[PDB]
């Protein structure tokens, strides 16, 4: 058997976004099931088998920062990732409230300062900055954010780093996103430039989207709750209850994959390949797959 | 007003790919109208008022390289290319016939040479390679190619270059792909490695997905016909009728940007914004956006 060209990934995680889940049982701008739509992937992703190191959400977890939101959150998440042997990194976006996140999510004290945390799993750091502005919705990060980023990130990971922010610092296809944007991306940029942030996973858009920001690839997972349409027209914008989803992150050696989860289901096109299957038929073809470094 | 953080970009390009056209009017394995998933895209796409200035389809046009499948595909295809004022770049995918491309797709004399292609958009420059292997279904660069791609790559094009292909360089979620991976990436890693490629767009894989490869992004556009549903069992595959669309890919004067197009619908959810009301609000928020440099 020869080798695939690439092994099995080092880490893998999930990156969800963009949850905007409400206190009690009422439909999300009296439109869609938010509760429903995160279940239902939660659900999808926990049968699939997958186990990821770490499952990120990027932001806007409750629509209104609601204490009954974070808990409600709390409640479907903590026994997923518990489930699925997985570390939880939880990050702001410009829905939350960063006292009423703590307190009700975290077991923190109640504070207003920026949510702006790290962390390692082995080799790999993450970092979570938080890009929400209280009372706003437009993305800013402070000078002693970009201090504090820059001290961080003096020196490498054995693994590399990914931050994690809501507000993406990329150019958006839909013009209403200039109203709510981060700003001042070049002072980010300068800190940024040069060091081992090997990923920027972010969320705000609610449209799968990726570029790179000063050499460093940005993702933009799409939303669970409800999603941009990009057939509407051009100048305008729609959200729609359709096409949610999340990423997920493969970390490999020499590169980071990320991949669009849609929501499960559509009737079957061709044939289905089950795991021992695809075992024999991989076999088969005279290949093997190298496993992980951390297998 | 204030200018947003970019400005509008330099270039707009569609990216669509894996079409999978059959002759007549059967569905495509039995399971979905290829020709139906198509001209639903095309016909968004159409009415949302894009203008993109090329049109780049990424292989697997006709899914047995049918001459009735390619005349289908030109008919349904070059109408919307004039109506949008793009130039049409196609390439060839592990399902399609190159001489019957040639001919009933390009008015091309049949070759079985290799489909590899350059041209320029202004500045911008397009390079369109064949990873087929006629008679195969994985991905492979002959060497003869391979020098062909570092004479053309020698230099620069003022707004860089767009590589264009089937077989993408990166590492795929699902187990079965590596049957029919791209081959020996790391000759084409050494000959990219340090060149003014942009961007890699790619298709095969039948999901959304971006990497890097030798430090150049890659976007995978998922399938208009069907895509994989990656809830399946981990190490099997299924493909599905749904989640289907393609990719719009912005070229910034600093980034590349590539945003994922799912088919149009879905009931709306919270405010729909005209156009019209989106320059007002823009406007209201104290905002401009910086015209293209190509306006
Ligand atoms: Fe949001
Ligand atoms: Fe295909
Ligand atoms: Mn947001
Ligand atoms: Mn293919």
């Given at each position: 058997?020869?080798?695939?060209?690439?092994?099995?990934?080092?880490?893998?995680?999930?990156?969800?976004?963009?949850?905007?889940?409400?206190?009690?049982?009422?439909?999300?701008?009296?439109?869609?099931?938010?509760?429903?739509?995160?279940?239902?992937?939660?659900?999808q992703?926990?049968?699939?088998?997958?186990?990821?190191?770490?499952?990120?959400?990027?932001?806007?977890?409750?629509?209104?920062?609601?204490?009954?939101?974070?808990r409600?959150?709390?409640?479907?998440?903590?026994?997923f990732?518990?489930?699925?042997?997985?570390?939880?990194?939880?990050?702001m976006?410009?829905?939350?409230?960063?006292?009423?996140?703590?307190?009700?999510?975290?077991?923190?004290?109640?504070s207003?300062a920026?949510?702006?945390?790290?962390?390692?799993?082995?080799?790999?750091?993450?970092?979570?900055?938080?890009?929400?502005?209280p009372?706003?919705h437009?993305?800013?990060?402070?000078?002693?954010?970009?201090?504090?980023?820059?001290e961080?990130?003096?020196?490498?990971?054995?693994?590399?780093?990914?931050?994690?922010?809501?507000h993406?610092?990329?150019?958006?296809?839909?013009?209403?996103?200039?109203?709510?944007?981060?700003?001042?991306?070049?002072?980010?940029?300068?800190?940024?430039?040069?060091?081992?942030?090997?990923?920027?996973?972010?969320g705000?858009?609610?449209?799968?989207?990726?570029?790179?920001?000063?050499?460093?690839?940005?993702?933009?997972?799409?939303?669970?709750?409800?999603?941009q349409?990009?057939?509407?027209?051009?100048?305008?914008?729609?959200?729609?209850?359709?096409?949610?989803?999340?990423?997920?992150?493969?970390?490999?050696?020499?590169?980071?994959?990320?991949s669009?989860?849609?929501?499960?289901?559509?009737?079957?096109?061709?044939?289905?390949?089950?795991?021992?299957?695809?075992?024999?038929?991989?076999?088969?073809?005279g290949?093997?797959?190298?496993?992980?470094?951390?297998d």
């Amino acid at each position: 058997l020869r080798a695939a060209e690439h092994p099995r990934p080092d880490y893998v995680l999930l990156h969800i976004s963009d949850t905007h889940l409400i206190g009690g049982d009422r439909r999300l701008y009296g439109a869609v099931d938010a509760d429903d739509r995160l279940g239902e992937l939660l659900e999808q992703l926990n049968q699939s088998g997958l186990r990821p190191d770490a499952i990120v959400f990027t932001g806007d977890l409750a629509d209104k920062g609601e204490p009954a939101a974070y808990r409600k959150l709390r409640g479907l998440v903590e026994p997923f990732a518990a489930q699925l042997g997985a570390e939880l990194v939880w990050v702001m976006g410009n829905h939350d409230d960063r006292a009423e996140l703590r307190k009700f999510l975290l077991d923190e004290a109640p504070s207003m300062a920026p949510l702006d945390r790290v962390c390692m799993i082995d080799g790999l750091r993450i970092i979570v900055l938080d890009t929400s502005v209280p009372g706003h919705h437009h993305g800013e990060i402070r000078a002693s954010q970009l201090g504090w980023l820059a001290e961080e990130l003096a020196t490498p990971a054995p693994d590399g780093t990914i931050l994690a922010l809501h507000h993406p610092p990329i150019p958006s296809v839909l013009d209403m996103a200039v109203t709510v944007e981060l700003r001042d991306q070049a002072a980010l940029g300068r800190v940024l430039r040069g060091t081992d942030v090997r990923a920027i996973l972010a969320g705000h858009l609610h449209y799968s989207t990726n570029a790179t920001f000063v050499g460093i690839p940005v993702s933009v997972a799409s939303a669970t709750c409800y999603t941009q349409d990009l057939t509407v027209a051009a100048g305008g914008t729609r959200g729609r209850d359709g096409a949610q989803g999340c990423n997920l992150v493969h970390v490999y050696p020499d590169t980071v994959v990320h991949s669009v989860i849609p929501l499960g289901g559509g009737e079957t096109v061709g044939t289905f390949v089950s795991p021992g299957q695809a075992r024999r038929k991989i076999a088969e073809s005279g290949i093997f797959i190298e496993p992980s470094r951390r297998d």
